[PDB]
Design an enzyme around this catalytic site. Structure first.
Site: not given
Ligand SMILES: [Mn+2]
Ligand SMILES: [Mn+2]
Ligand SMILES: C[C@H](C[C@@H](C[C@H](C[C@@H](C[C@@H](CCN1CCCC1=O)N1CCCC1=O)N1CCCC1=O)N1CCCC1=O)N1CCCC1=O)N1CCCC1=O
Ligand SMILES: COc1cc(CCNC(=O)c2nc(C(C)(C)NC(=O)OCc3ccccc3)[nH]c(=O)c2O)ccc1O
Length: 178
Positions: A64, A92, A118
């Site tokens: 990220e 991430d 998710k």
């Molecule tokens: Mn995330």
């Molecule tokens: Mn992400």
């Protein structure tokens, strides 16, 4: 002329907000119009940076923050170097200690429905999931919270302080519902 925006600018450090503007504009959304996503993206960013700060010096590769194409470049290199299947969606982080991608989440609902959302979004089993809430609860896949209790505690304290700040500025409920 939103005040959620001025709050986001006074609450997060300038590089968090700069990266969040970059990431929202790259996906065609205005930080000044949808200010609550703006806030969420700063929060996600900062949580990820604290999370990477939590391990040892070489433990995590940060995904990220980067530009989408370089993010996928580094993901590709981690795959072709480690022998891990290329996740369907951009993760991430990557844990060199644990040999796995990490997907971080920050929810205003509670732990559960976000974790399931998710998990079925990914649904490729390999990459680790780790959720925090604005109320101090947390969860990672297979009960493997990756970091030590004190780093995750620092995260939770920060999330609740942000919640407190928004509430004191009366922006908390609007942030909660969206
Ligand atoms: Mn995330
Ligand atoms: Mn992400
Ligand atoms: C001051 C903070 C910095 C740290 C965030 C992060 C810095 C940037 C690198 C900068 N850019 C710009 C583009 C190219 C590039 O590389 N990004 C973004 C992508 C991944 C990455 O590394 N990191 C992490 C490793 C050290 C560092 O600087 N943050 C911000 C919130 C808390 C935190 O830890 N730091 C540094 C350690 C102590 C501290 O407070
Ligand atoms: C699709 O548009 C956006 C896309 C991006 C870049 C990719 N995004 C993520 O990688 C990511 N984003 C979120 C938020 C909270 C922003 N929304 C969500 O995915 O839920 N949470 C995560 O845990 C996470 O990994 C940034 C901003 C956006 O608006």
């Amino acid at each position: 002329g939103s005040h959620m925006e001025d709050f986001v600018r006074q609450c997060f450090n300038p590089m968090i907000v700069e990266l969040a503007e970059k990431a929202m504009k790259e996906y065609g959304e205005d930080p000044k119009i949808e200010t609550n996503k703006f806030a969420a993206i700063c929060t996600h960013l900062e949580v990820c940076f604290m999370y990477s700060d939590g391990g040892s010096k070489h433990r995590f590769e940060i995904i990220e923050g980067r530009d989408r194409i370089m993010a996928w470049t580094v993901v590709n290199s981690i795959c072709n170097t480690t022998g891990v299947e290329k996740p369907k969606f951009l993760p991430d982080l990557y844990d060199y200690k644990e040999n796995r991608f990490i997907e971080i989440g920050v929810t205003r609902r509670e732990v559960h429905i976000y974790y399931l959302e998710k998990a079925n979004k990914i649904k490729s089993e390999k990459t680790h999931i780790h959720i925090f809430s604005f109320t101090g609860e947390e969860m990672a896949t297979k009960a493997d919270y990756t970091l030590d209790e004190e780093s995750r505690a620092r995260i939770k304290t920060r999330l609740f302080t942000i919640r407190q700040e928004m509430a004191s500025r009366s922006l908390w409920d609007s942030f909660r519902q969206s």
